[model samples]
Target chain A: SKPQPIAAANWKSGSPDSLSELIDLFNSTSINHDVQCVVASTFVHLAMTKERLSHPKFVIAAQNAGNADALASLKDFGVNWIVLGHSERRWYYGETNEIVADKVAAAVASGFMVIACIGETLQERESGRTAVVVLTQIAAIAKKLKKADWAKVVIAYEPVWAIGTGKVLTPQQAQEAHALIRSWVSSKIGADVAGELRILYGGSVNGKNARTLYQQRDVNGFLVGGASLKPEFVDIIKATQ
Target chain B: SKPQPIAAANWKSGSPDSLSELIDLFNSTSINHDVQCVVASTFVHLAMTKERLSHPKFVIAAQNAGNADALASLKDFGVNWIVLGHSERRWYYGETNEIVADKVAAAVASGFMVIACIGETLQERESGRTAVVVLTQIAAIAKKLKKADWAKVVIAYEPVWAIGTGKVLTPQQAQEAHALIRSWVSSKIGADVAGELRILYGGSVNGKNARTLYQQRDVNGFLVGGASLKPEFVDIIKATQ
Candidate 1:
């Protein structure tokens, strides 16, 4: 109940040289309330180690981490938050749902704040299996997570069809997915835990639509993609305020 | 023509605490005739940038880099080498030959040396498609690579079935694969470049068997796996001595 809404930036395929400028811009920008802002950096940027220390308000995420050894490397460098099981990771990197669950558990056990991503593809969605697929993914993750791990976890629902495709889920659609994800948690665990869990909508989210999406009952925040690299990301951050 | 045979270490999934210790040991150890020893560290190990300054003889490689942004991140960090398109990346991450080709071209264009890995699975090998599959993979790279890029490329052939399975290919089997790779280069690029090209054998390569593997006429060096994380990697480094 005390958890603040989160706005995470996934700089998926952006250059690392401009990270300093982005961090500087974010450091100067402020929200009226205590909103958790995170920048999910690619693993290759070691400069993020220093970034973690320099920026207190912002979280640094290790994107696509599947192995404890990899996560431990992030942990050793003072990084605590990690993003796993993104659709691209599943589609391109062959990260199975089981692998994602295993990674989520490993990250949680290592005391990391894990953003476990789950979603359905266009085919799955058209077949009326959106909830079914996302639920199955969560079921795999549920088996791995401890009760304590739930507190440190946030679920990001990034529909595979919307990712990098310029297609976005409408506010209502976003809320429906968020509500379903929350309901799964309520059914599997408890309503109290589900109430506290942050459900972030991803895929084609931008500054223009952030406010509308955030206005939804269950849409806590966003896992932003292309817009994250632009100045509009700040607007997206400020949208909730 | 001046390139030394490389005994590259791919610590695919290893920890950070041990990395410092390993780097210290390798820095103290001397290579015979500049075997071009490279340590392919995971992306999370940011300490490697400083390690690069400390160890002049060793090259630091990102264990696996697919995106140009990840490559750019490594380059910004002063990392000039990357391991990509490994059998595991292919088997697990869905890294197709075209994707690998794209990455290799990007890395080469950005002036990074690439350890381009290719190999056949057990099923393919038993079906007698090992050479055919490998040649096709090379052809994809050849299509993307400029003649100038060839100097910066080191092809590592790791039989998918043998990787981390402790089933090292016999000297004859290893030689056959190496010879085929060289022939592919000769046919596509030219004979002179093929003779100078370093084709490394990967898959369960360890200190005990390194010298024997290196003894083959075609086997230029090795792309080490599990043994790379251990201190015995030093022995593998010194095998050519």
Candidate 2:
């Protein structure tokens, strides 16, 4: 059985007016029921976005959570999904792998699903340590999660070099990383959980390359960045077909 | 002329349901026009809070901001004030003094009022380096602001030792720090600006202690923490009289 394809739009810190328009655009777009579409809004826009976006297949997610209290606030606002360990948070805010794992454990304990992000920087990739870097990141998270908690988690593999840089990973390159992640999960967790787990490829993912990227067996879906803020997000969502 | 006193409630990340009750309490309470009041809500609750809290003097603020884009989003959400450089952010998230300064500059540049927090940890205080630690923190923000930008900034001197610890600085101890900050501002900027500036004391401020603390010559107001979530917050607000 195929994992349900997820296309998540991460609008990092977009304005409320723009978010309103984006919600309207999403409401008007026809989405396939088979695809699980998510819109990740900044903390301020979550409540409004939740109220305005009217697709049953579409759900709202918070871009990040500061602590358990923040997770509790999100739960009270009816938001069940949150993106954790974004590279931006890691790089700019100094969120260590241990800290990211702590946040994931808190979010799961509070009953929210998580899009746990892990990625390697260009230096690591160039040095051929991409596997080591990402796997270490995953291993930190793996230590904190219970086997059953895998059901509530989605893995987002976003290469730091590609995020917002307009550079993208080739489909084969993307598949290679996805395959590596899936294999690690299979060995560490279980083959059944790994097969059921959805690994979303983020960083420079857009409408143009989504289909080819999705064609890879291990690439479950996408975590669209800048394109998620534009109309092209619809195309990326449709790429799941 | 005395500076207008301000009472800001920093509900680090409060739930929406409790926020509604707090708003109701505030609406029912009579606030003195002489005092400025602010409520800082988490990002997720800002929209609902703004809509529900019906007070002319009670403007909304954000607990923190990530970047210029977050400032723009806050502006679009009608938030005029943001709290930056809280010790929680500095300690838990590894926000260095330089990063806090950059955030303050961006918030000010984006035309938002800022509650710029600075404080010395218990270790620094015990080591008699409180002035050095706090002054260094202030200097970081001072470098980023123009003379005119002072009007948009409120300095929150929340000692890390006191925050949520139920241990408060004695009125004399707090005044010494506040007076030092004011004198530094007077020397660095000007007497006129320093006289007009409102320096807030944060950390374990509650209804019982508000009046005596407000009596301090340099204590312009408070940045209420845990008490901000309760009915007693109104008592703290009224203590300005």
Candidate 3:
């Protein structure tokens, strides 16, 4: 299964001007065509005209929408992809699984691509309850999206322990978790579709560690944080090369 | 106290084209200069050039911002005003008083006009805890801002019960609530600033009921909802006449 590798940047809270410069930089630089690049910016750009997505390699993704209706508006603005259920969203904001499930259902049904994120907290991981926590988060989403709907969905597993803490999961750890995720998908759907699914490893993923992480058996791509706005992001993009 | 009898339209989930038409309609109509008009639209327009706010009588307002930094970006886009603490935000989303206070402090500190909203849920109102709930919500903000900062803030008392529920606080109820809020402001800041502060009644406030709501001594203006998008909003704007 030639699952295409995807690299997404979540500039969670930057303004239009800063992101504009970043987008310009992305367009000016020549990058690999094999890796699909996505820009997930603040909702401030939700009103951004679709004309801005003229860059063939870069597409705009929203951080989160308040509700299903807002998700529909994002699509109207030509935002085909949305990132949901980040640890920041679930822990800080009160984004419950029910809310995320509803949004996932609406987004998939409306034909928008969804980057549904799930992660176990530091405490959960420390207690060795990682898979249990991640699976619970996924069960809600799976209920909303069938195996057929999985095509438009990329499940990003970001261990809350590693996010923004300057920490990362070891390749073995990421591989094990990703393999387990695929196992769940395989059991839930079938081995054919599960193998075809692209599960991403997020949480403090930088260019230096990106190549190692992607080399893991099941790590299809990355959902980067701080390094997303830095020049090293290109390094992470080309790491697969 | 030339509070200017403000009338605001919160285009909660409208597309840019619709708001553009609304802005155009407002520009074409000969509305009263005595009333200040504001459009509190989705964050989609944060990238909207400052040239849009150049319409002498009209100002742009953001429905909400993700964080304090995002609030600063609003000013960078020439948005001098923001609508915060709407029950829609507080109830549906995870907006707490502490969060709203931080934004109010940031917005006020950054020299942006703030339409700070405070309201009682139906349960609280039914239990005769309306004033208590509203006052507690204000204390968070009052502690953050000095007496001088009150000028930059407009307190919008949108009772959750009255918001889009096709129900409104009776004229007497609204006046009582407004007066109570004014009294709290008076106690917190002083009588002079309290009287000068514009306390608006939001929720189910249409053009037909706007004049009566305005006639009340403490009711200075409105943070209108549905009617704001309609031509009837003009009637509400002229109600002061």
Candidate 4:
């Protein structure tokens, strides 16, 4: 609940740099983030990012991609999944829906699964355009790909307006958004995906809200935000299940 | 005797979708660059770039700073430096010295050291305009900042003709270029700084040529290229002595 990621605790006094160094830090320090929580940075640092993968309880999620570049880096280092696109990347920068779509194609082509994001603005919701914007964005990328690609993608729906400001989506509203996105996926991608896809809700997602948010029929998990920076970042990760 | 910026080795694998998972890989692995280095990505992975700062010896340099938005993120993360105005950033993206200067100024304001790159076209070099072009470009920025700001600067004189094409500058020619830049600094910045400031020669800067290049009077060190990917990346660092 409290904010963190302030500094890597005991980092200045930690052992030498590397994965083993991390284990030492965890073992020696009062650091409390769940070591089980997987962490990843996109692109290079593969050697460095591989630290969590060796932990029996940990996994990974690459945080960026620009078409084929990230995919190539993943295969070279044997990474598992790429986060196809993020709202922060798109909204803050200018990653287009199509650019993300191409990145999805290229990543799957190269053999890694993907975490694809689709979010709507609060205005879209206020004007009752939520279903339309979210579905349209999801369909734009989903229709062109194969069922296999769906297997490779974890869909995240983040409300643009709620991010970083602490305004959270109500459970019903999140459910509605998930259902809307789910229906679109069933029609555009397939029913198998609708059944199998692990749809997540993102946007200022935090430890405090993770439990209720994870209860939505269609919201199988969460893609957290600033809370993900805190020691609770790990607590939130485990909260859903 | 002078500080040189670090360049991490990147061996890309295939698949963009796997990008995030690589972070787990980093967390699980143990790698000592032998020498310190920073991992990086194009604009898309800026957040991750910031995240990895937990490791003191490891930092992230956004691989692609295509515009103000990109540079803005780099600065916000307290990026140590921006690889301003590289050959690819110029040739592939149409970046010029003036525009790069703009980025440098932006980075400096955001508290990042500016690894301002200066290089000229092969035509410009062959035509004896290399000095003219290089100095003209540097002067454009040199005129903009206060003398103290130069301390945060590392002038990387990567001759355009020698970067990836494997054209090696004669020890003499390389010396001539660094001396020219130093002379300009002595004239423009000051003589005290001319001897103290670190001037690096980059471009086909392999371990093999490191000794020859570092041997130059004004060639304080090198900004290595291809060899940066191999284990030999460390050899060049030790070569400094």
Number of the predicted model whose TM-score against the real structure is largest: 2
- DockQ top scorer: 4
Enumerate the chain B TM-scores of all models.
0.92, 0.95, 0.91, 0.77
iRMSD for each candidate structure, in the order shown:
14.2, 12.7, 12.4, 10.5
Q: Using alpha carbons, what is the TM-score of model 3? A: 0.53
Candidate 3 chain A weakest lDDT stretch, 10 residues: A44-53
Question: Which regions of candidate 3 deviate over 4 angstroms?
Answer: A46-53, A163-166, B1-241
Compose the digit string of candidate 3's lDDT tens values, residues A147-231. Answer: 7898888889887776566765789988898988888988987888787787888877777888888888888888888888777
Model 1, A91-158: lDDT tens digits are 44446689789999888888889888998876678789898889999999999887768998999998
For TM-score, candidate 2 versus 3, the one ahead is: 2
Candidate 2 structure, TM-score to reference: 0.54
User: In candidate 1, which residue pairs get closer than 3 Å at backbone N, Cα or C atoms, i.e. clash?
Assistant: A93-B93
Q: Which ten residues in a row have the lowest lDDT in candidate 1 chain A?
A: A46-55
lDDT (10s digit) by residue, model 1, range B102-167: 988988888788999998887889888987888999999899988878989999988786645666
Clash pairs, model 2 backbone: A43-B43
Q: Regarding lDDT, does 2 or 4 come out ahead?
A: 2
Model 2 stretches with alpha carbons more than 4 Å out = A163-166, B1-241
Q: Which portions of model 1 show Cα errors greater than 4 Å?
A: A49-53, A163-166, B1-241
DockQ of 2: 0.03
Ranked by lDDT, top first: 2, 1, 3, 4
| Ten contiguous residues with the weakest lDDT in model 1 chain B | B44-53
Q: Write the per-residue lDDT of candidate 4 for residues B51-74, one digit (tens) a residue.
A: 432444555554445556655534
Residue A25 lDDT (model 3): 70
